């Protein structure tokens, strides 16, 4: 059961990422597949009718079913354990109107399943409501993500806000020597070149070569973090002309697990560029393409499990991810666009995903 829900959370989150990357061609994007699954699973308890059916059908599981929520509670405790060492910061929050009569029994049931509460804020005080959302993210990401650019859209009419924020800056198992860091040329998808600092180290890295259904070769390299608890999978096509879209559209939790199994250690000189990327995305259009259309529509939305008094709808759905990648004879030069995956090896959870077009 804990490995089963982690597989469903990863599969759903990859499908959301595949939609955000489709509308972000030739541009840097960082997304948390595990993060978007957590907020959507919490929202599954606030919904009713056909609105609740649309989320359950896309996610592949019902949150009220036996052993579904205790498996996610065990997963979060495992991911935020003693190994953490201030590398990851996860936060999930749902905001609703303060003077709104909630269904008697919702609040105790919500805390029983996620060990969290739905925050009640007055949206009449626009600037005060904007501060509470930004301050909640600030205090729960240890001050890494302090502001959300999407909060500038909330007003006196806003009644429901969905927010998720993730931070990553992991410690490598075998760190990169700072003396090897030098500025190298990076080729862009349009044909232009840019000079960016690149890390280098000689080690026995896990390597594999896979093929796309079209018939194009692509290589995968594994970079483990301290205690092998986490690993970064760098995916890039063999041919310089092949775009990253071909590799993105075929992603899944099974494929990443299949990459690890077919991998064999090889002595190489890896040249990986340094990148500190940040991306904030509105989840209206990506969740709409997956089937969840009702939750955003004013009259078609059903949130009877949260409140039957006033009609509600998701006015704002956001995710802000900040990833940091720093230092702490055959060669592999990563000097062209590539894909990255941050996997939690014991459960197989896809924590982070993205495409680096320009570091």
Swiss-Prot record:
Effect of residue 171 to C: Increased half-life of the active form
Residues bearing attached sugar chains per UniProt: 206, 262, 326
UniProt subcellular location: Secreted
Signal among keywords: yes
Tissue distribution of the protein: Expressed in endothelial cells. Found in plasma, platelets, and hepatoma and fibrosarcoma cells.
Domain of life of the organism encoding this protein: Eukaryota
GO biological process, one term: negative regulation of smooth muscle cell migration
SUPFAM superfamilies named among the record's database cross-references: Serpins
Induction (free text): Up-regulated by coagulation factor Xa (F10) in atrial tissues. Up-regulated in atrial tissues by rapid pacing resembling atrial fibrillation.
Main location: secreted
Keywords per UniProt: Glycoprotein, Protease inhibitor, Secreted, Serine protease inhibitor, Signal
Post-translational modifications: Inactivated by proteolytic attack of the urokinase-type (u-PA) and the tissue-type (TPA), cleaving the 369-Arg-|-Met-370 bond.
Disease: Plasminogen activator inhibitor-1 deficiency: A hematologic disorder characterized by increased bleeding after trauma, injury, or surgery. Affected females have menorrhagia. The bleeding defect is due to increased fibrinolysis of fibrin blood clots due to deficiency of plasminogen activator inhibitor-1, which inhibits tissue and urinary activators of plasminogen.
Family per similarity comment: Belongs to the serpin family.
Biological function: Serine protease inhibitor. Inhibits TMPRSS7. Is a primary inhibitor of tissue-type plasminogen activator (PLAT) and urokinase-type plasminogen activator (PLAU). As PLAT inhibitor, it is required for fibrinolysis down-regulation and is responsible for the controlled degradation of blood clots. As PLAU inhibitor, it is involved in the regulation of cell adhesion and spreading. Acts as a regulator of cell migration, independently of its role as protease inhibitor. It is required for stimulation of keratinocyte migration during cutaneous injury repair.
PANTHER family for the chain: PLASMINOGEN ACTIVATOR INHIBITOR 1, SERINE PROTEASE INHIBITOR, SERPIN
Assembly description: Forms a heterodimer with TMPRSS7. Interacts with VTN. Binds LRP1B; binding is followed by internalization and degradation. Interacts with PPP1CB. In complex with PLAU/uPA, interacts with PLAUR/uPAR. Interacts with SORL1 and LRP1, either alone or in complex with PLAU; these interactions are abolished in the presence of LRPAP1/RAP. The ternary complex composed of PLAUR-PLAU-PAI1 also interacts with SORL1. Interacts with PLAT/tPA. Also interacts with SORL1, when complexed to PLAT/tPA.
Name of protein: Plasminogen activator inhibitor 1
Taxon lineage: Eukaryota, Metazoa, Chordata, Craniata, Vertebrata
Gene name, Swiss-Prot/TrEMBL: SERPINE1
């Amino acid at each position: 059961a804990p490995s089963y829900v982690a597989h469903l959370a990863s599969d759903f989150g990859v499908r959301v990422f595949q939609q955000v990357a489709q509308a972000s061609k030739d541009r840097n994007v960082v997304f948390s597949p595990y993060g978007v699954a957590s907020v959507l699973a919490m929202l599954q308890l606030t919904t009713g009718g056909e609105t609740q059916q649309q989320i359950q059908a896309a996610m592949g599981f019902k949150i009220d079913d036996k052993g579904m929520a205790p498996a996610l509670r065990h997963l979060y405790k495992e991911l935020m354990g003693p190994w953490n060492k201030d590398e990851i910061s996860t936060t999930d929050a749902i905001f609703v109107q303060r003077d709104l009569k909630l269904v008697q029994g919702f609040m105790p049931h919500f805390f029983r399943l996620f060990r969290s509460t739905v925050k009640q804020v007055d949206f009449s005080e626009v600037e005060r409501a904007r501060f509470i959302i930004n301050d909640w993210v600030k205090t729960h990401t240890k001050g890494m993500i302090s502001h959300l650019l999407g909060t500038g859209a909330v007003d006196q009419l806003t009644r429901l806000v969905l927010v998720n924020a993730l931070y990553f800056n992991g410690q490598w198992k075998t760190p990169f020597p700072d003396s090897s860091t030098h500025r190298r040329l990076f080729h862009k998808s349009d044909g232009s070149t840019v000079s960016v600092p690149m890390m280098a180290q000689t080690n026995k890295f896990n390597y594999t070569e896979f093929t796309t259904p079209d018939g194009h070769y692509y290589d995968i390299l594994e970079l483990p973090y301290h205690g092998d608890t986490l690993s970064m999978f760098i995916a890039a096509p063999y041919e310089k002309e092949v775009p990253l879209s071909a590799l993105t559209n075929i992603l899944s939790a099974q494929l990443i697990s299949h990459w690890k199994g077919n991998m064999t250690r090889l002595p190489r000189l890896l040249v990986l560029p340094k990148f500190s990327l940040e991306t904030e995305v509105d989840l209206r259009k990506p969740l709409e393409n997956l089937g969840m259309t009702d939750m955003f529509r004013q009259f078609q939305a059903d949130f009877t499990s949260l409140s039957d008094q006033e009609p509600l709808h998701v006015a704002l759905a956001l995710q802000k991810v900040k990833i940091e990648v720093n230092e702490s004879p055959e060669e592999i030069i990563i000097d062209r666009p590539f894909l990255f995956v941050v996997r939690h090896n014991p459960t197989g959870t896809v924590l982070f995903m993205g495409q680096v077009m320009e570091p």
